[PDB]
């Protein structure tokens, strides 16, 4: 089972206005499409600098999101293909759920079994039979031979997990990941969009790899099925999602959550810009900004915090920085036994 998480590198900056206008006229009135595409072509100004935006879209437009959600949809038809997209979406009179199929045969009739595009980050889950995986590997290696076994060099991995819990860069598994990524990249024309290997992660689960890794919506997720490498189905650990099979109603897998490094860095930078822009500012405003940021992070993750042991240190360090800022505001000389009241 191979999962490819990636993102269209510069979709916003590469949406051709004429093609976008045609695609919008496909779905909306030509007057509305012309208005939207003309609104996307205006003079961008900043201080003394100004130019005209004639290639990309302007994301500050109120309807721009719609455009993105439309343009990315087209990319899905380029990735999934019309047949698989129709199988996923179901019949037009009986639309399917988010992750469901009308029949089991439709589910098992294509390598691509799960897909979610989000805004620009596509997560795809393929299930490959040994013959299909071997055929894809040979097809990829036909035009990309690797006598030196160099496919392991640039293969991205989720370093936040230990070596055993990480993805294991075995030769066959790495070859399959590269083959899957190359197959996906070949579908999308290089001009309408593109997928970059460096800014993407492919994780495969096989006999060699027991853990299925990915990252979505700031969550570093790892599924370890109970069948193979679950010594104990512990429930006390509250940062672990306990996946269940809806048919057997039995314990089958186990999901470990973790806060992504990018989310931690974003929170740290938010606290930094709270602190550094706090010279002639009231203590109440600084504490309110800190509280808002902290409650946003903690109520967004709510489980990935406990497993991310680095996030706890980051949070307490940021709290100490805020309290030190307040104390320095009160008096230049730092206190020795300042109270928490």
């Amino acid at each position: 089972n191979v999962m490819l998480e990636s993102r269209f590198e510069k979709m916003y900056e590469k949406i051709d206005l004429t093609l976008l206008n045609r695609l919008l006229r496909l779905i909306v009135d030509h007057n509305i499409a012309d208005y939207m595409t003309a609104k996307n072509n205006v003079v961008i100004n900043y201080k003394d600098m100004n130019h005209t935006n004639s290639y990309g879209i302007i994301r500050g437009l109120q309807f721009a999101s719609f455009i993105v959600q439309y343009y990315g949809l087209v990319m899905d038809l380029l990735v999934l293909g019309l047949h698989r997209a129709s199988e996923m979406a179901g019949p037009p009179q009986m639309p399917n759920d988010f992750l469901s199929f009308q029949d089991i045969a439709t589910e098992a009739a294509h390598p691509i079994r799960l897909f979610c595009r989000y805004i620009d980050r596509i997560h795809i889950f393929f299930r490959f039979t040994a013959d299909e995986a071997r055929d894809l590997i040979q097809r990829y290696l036909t035009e990309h031979p690797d006598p030196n076994n160099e496919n392991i060099v640039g293969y991205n991995n989720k370093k936040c997990w230990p070596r055993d819990a990480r993805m294991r860069l075995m030769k066959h598994d790495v070859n399959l990941g590269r083959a899957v990524f190359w197959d996906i990249k070949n579908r999308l024309p290089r001009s309408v969009t593109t997928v970059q290997w460096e800014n993407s992660f492919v994780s495969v689960y096989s006999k060699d790899n027991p853990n299925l890794l990915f990252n979505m919506c700031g969550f570093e997720c790892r599924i370890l099925p109970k069948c193979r490498t679950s010594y104990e189905e512990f429930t006390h650990k509250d940062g672990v999602w306990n996946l269940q099979n809806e048919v057997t109603k039995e314990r089958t897998a186990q999901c470990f959550l973790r806060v992504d490094d990018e989310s931690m860095q974003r929170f740290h930078n938010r606290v930094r810009q709270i602190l550094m822009a706090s010279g002639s500012t009231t203590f109440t405003k600084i504490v309110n900004k800190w509280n808002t940021a902290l409650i946003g992070l903690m109520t967004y993750f709510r489980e990935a915090v406990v497993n991310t042991q680095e996030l706890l240190d980051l949070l307490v360090k940021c709290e100490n920085k805020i309290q030190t800022r307040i104390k320095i505001g009160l008096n230049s000389k730092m206190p020795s036994r300042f109270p928490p009241v």
Binding site: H236, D238, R302, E303, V306, Q309, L312, D313, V316, K317, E319, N320, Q323, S336, R337, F338, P339, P340
Partner: peptide, 22 residues
């Protein structure tokens, strides 16, 4: 007594996150 916010990595790990919530 210092008042410094100490990290709870390994501290207060016995309790769940559902405690003290209704």
């Amino acid at each position: 007594p210092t008042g410094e916010v100490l990290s709870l990595v390994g501290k207060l790990e016995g309790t769940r996150m559902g405690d003290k919530a209704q």
